[model samples]
Target: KELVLALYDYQEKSPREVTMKKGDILTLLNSTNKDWWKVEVKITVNGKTYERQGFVPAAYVKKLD
Candidate 1:
């Protein structure tokens, strides 16, 4: 199955809290001028990391806090 992800930008520094519950869509936003932000996300059932270009479903993301 395929998952849909969304992009988001952090208005602050590291350790930013992402308000998202289980089974939500998420996407990592990157800019050429800014550095890549580090986020810890939890994936529900079938825990595995999939590498791709863009867009990742929240179902795959368990938590980002």
Candidate 2:
């Protein structure tokens, strides 16, 4: 299974310039609105990570780096 994980910069910030490698678990940082501050888990299959804006779960995010 191959995937294209693209990293995006929120709020026009700096882009991570990388993709989610295999066995890479991404951690969700902070989020807006009324939501939990827990970390989110994003399992990297091949190398594709959906990029979105606003309120990213901290469970799927490993770190900001």
Candidate 3:
């Protein structure tokens, strides 16, 4: 699975999008859209990992390249 680091916090504008926080590790699913990409993020809560998938701003994430 391709992955990237969330460089900044981004709030979702609509239900089809996802929100991300700084330092989040986002799983890259699709990059067909140049401005937005489909991704999945797992957040830990009480030892449980919550999985979420939606579109996010490509600019908010970064990779080592």
| Local distance difference test values of all predictions, in order | 0.37, 0.34, 0.86
Highest-TM-score candidate: 3
Answer with 1 or 2, whichever has the higher TM-score: 1
Q: Candidate 1 lDDT (Cα, whole model)? A: 0.37
Structure candidate 3, residue pairs in collision: none
lDDT of 3 by residue, 30-55 (tens): 88889999998777999999988899
lDDT of 1 at 46: 69
Put down candidate 1 lDDT per residue, 1-65, tens digits, no spaces. 23323343323322344443444455444322233323334455568775323323223333332
Question: Residue by residue across 1-65, what tens digits does model 2's lDDT show?
Answer: 12221243222223322233344434444433242222233435579765432233233233444
Q: Cα RMSDs of all predictions?
A: 12.4, 11.8, 2.0
Off by over 4 Å in 2: 1-52
Clashes of each: 6, 21, 0
Q: What is the TM-score of each candidate against the true structure?
A: 0.23, 0.20, 0.79
Model 2 residue 59 distance off true place after TM-score fit, in angstroms: 1.1
In TM-score terms, candidate 1 sits at: 0.23
Candidate with top lDDT is 3
